[PDB]
C-alpha cells in the first residue's frame, strides 16, 4: 500500500524529510560496514563487543550430524507418553513403572530441570545427567541406556 | 449455488448470469465473500447442507474430514448487549445517572 507510505505526506516539502543543511547524499559514512576500526569504532564498541579478532581452534570439516544431541527435561517428561499411561500408575498394587523411550520420540540426552511427580519410571535414553538420575532415583525409578 | 456431486448442475446454472458453482469440498473465500464483504445469498442442496457438519463439525466434535481442526472459540456469547445492560442484576449495581445538562 503506497498510499499509506510516508512519501505521500512529503509531497510539497522541498527537502522531502531528509534535512536542509546536510542533504541526503549518496554514501556519507561509506558503503556497508565501512570502517570497523576507523570513524565507526564507537558504534562497534558500545553495541557489538567482541566483533574483531580470532578466538579458539579451527575445525575444518565440521558436520552437524555428529554433534546432534537434543535435550528434554524432567518437567516435560510425561507429555512424551499419552495421558492414560500415567493415570494407570500408582495403582493395581504392582508399581507398574511404565517405560518412556526418549530415543523413540527423537531426543537423546535427558536433563534434570523441573520437578518430577512421585511415580517410578523407566527411561530409555542415550545420555543422562547427574542431576537427572538423583531426581528419578529419589522418586524411585531407574534409568536404562540404549544405543 | 453450492453443489456436492457433479451430475449436470454445473451444466444447468451456467449461462444464467451471476450464479457461481462451488463444490462443498472446494469452497472458495473469493466467491463466498466478493469484495471483502461477508454478505452473500447462497443456494444449498440436501447433500451439500448435511456435509457442513462433516467438514468442520461442532465445537464438541472434530472436523472428521480435515486432520486437525475445530471451530474457533467465541470471544463473547451474549452478543446482544441491549439485554445485558437491561438485565436487572446489572441495573441493581448501577448508580443514579446524571442527565441534567450543565451549561456555562
Amino acid at each position: 500500500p503506497s498510499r499509506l507510505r510516508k512519501t505521500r505526506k512529503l509531497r510539497g516539502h522541498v527537502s522531502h524529510g531528509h534535512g536542509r543543511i546536510g542533504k541526503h547524499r549518496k554514501h556519507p559514512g561509506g558503503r556497508g560496514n565501512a570502517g570497523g576500526m576507523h570513524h565507526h569504532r564507537i558504534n562497534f564498541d558500545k553495541y557489538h563487543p567482541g566483533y574483531f579478532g580470532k578466538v579458539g581452534m579451527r575445525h575444518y570439516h565440521l558436520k552437524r550430524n555428529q554433534s546432534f544431541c537434543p535435550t528434554v527435561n524432567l518437567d516435560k517428561l510425561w507429555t512424551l507418553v499419552s495421558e492414560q499411561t500415567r493415570v494407570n500408575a500408582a495403582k493395581n498394587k504392582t508399581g507398574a513403572a511404565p517405560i518412556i523411550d526418549v530415543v523413540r520420540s527423537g531426543y537423546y540426552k535427558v536433563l534434570g530441570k523441573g520437578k518430577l511427580p512421585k511415580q517410578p519410571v523407566i527411561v530409555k535414553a542415550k545420555f543422562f545427567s547427574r542431576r537427572a538420575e538423583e531426581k528419578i532415583k529419589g522418586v524411585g525409578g531407574a534409568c536404562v541406556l540404549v544405543a | 449455488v453450492i453443489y456436492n456431486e457433479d451430475n449436470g448442475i454445473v451444466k444447468a446454472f451456467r449461462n444464467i448470469p451471476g450464479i457461481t458453482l462451488l463444490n462443498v469440498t472446494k469452497l472458495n473465500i473469493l466467491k463466498l465473500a466478493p469484495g471483502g464483504h461477508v454478505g452473500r445469498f447462497c443456494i444449498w442442496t440436501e447433500s451439500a447442507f448435511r456435509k457442513l457438519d462433516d467438514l468442520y463439525g461442532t465445537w464438541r466434535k472434530a472436523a472428521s474430514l480435515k486432520s486437525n481442526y475445530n471451530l474457533p472459540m467465541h470471544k463473547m456469547l451474549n452478543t446482544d448487549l441491549s439485554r445485558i445492560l437491561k438485565s436487572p442484576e446489572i441495573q441493581r449495581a448501577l448508580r443514579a445517572p446524571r442527565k441534567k445538562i450543565h451549561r456555562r
Binding site: - | 471483502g36 464483504h37 446482544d80
Partner: protein, 125 residues
C-alpha cells in the same frame, strides 16, 4: 443478534450513501432513513415501517413478526391504513404504544405517516 450485525452493516452496506457531508440509508422499513443503530429496518427483531399504498391513497404499515426469523417471505406483514387523516395517525399510534412494540419509533412513525398524506393530495394551486 442485533448489536453484533450492526457493527458490520454500519459502514459497508449497499444502502449506505454519504454523498457530500451527510449519511443516509435507503433500505426498506427504515423511517427517517438515517444510518443509525436505532433507525434500521433489518437488524432489529421488531421493525416499524411506513410506506405509501400501492394505489396512491393510504398508507400500508409493515410489522415484523418476531415469531420466525430467517424467513423473509413470512417475516413481514403489511396492513393498509386509509382513514380520514386523523384516525390514520391514531391507528398507527395504537399499533406501537398499546402493543408495547419497540416504542422508541412511536412518534417518528407518526411523523412519516403525516408527510405521506400530503403527497397523496392536490399540491399546487
Amino acid at each position: 443478534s442485533a448489536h453484533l450485525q450492526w457493527m458490520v452493516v454500519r459502514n459497508c452496506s449497499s444502502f449506505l450513501i454519504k454523498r457530500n457531508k451527510q449519511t443516509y440509508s435507503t433500505e426498506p422499513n427504515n423511517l427517517k432513513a438515517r444510518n443509525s443503530f436505532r433507525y434500521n429496518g433489518l437488524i432489529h427483531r421488531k421493525t416499524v415501517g411506513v410506506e405509501p399504498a400501492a394505489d396512491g391513497k393510504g398508507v400500508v404499515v409493515v410489522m415484523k413478526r418476531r415469531s420466525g426469523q430467517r424467513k423473509p417471505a413470512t417475516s413481514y406483514v403489511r396492513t393498509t391504513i386509509n382513514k380520514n387523516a386523523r384516525a390514520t395517525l391514531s391507528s398507527i399510534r395504537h399499533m406501537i404504544r398499546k402493543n408495547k412494540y419497540h416504542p422508541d419509533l412511536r412518534m417518528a412513525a407518526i411523523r412519516r405517516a403525516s408527510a405521506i398524506l400530503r403527497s397523496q393530495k392536490p399540491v399546487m394551486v
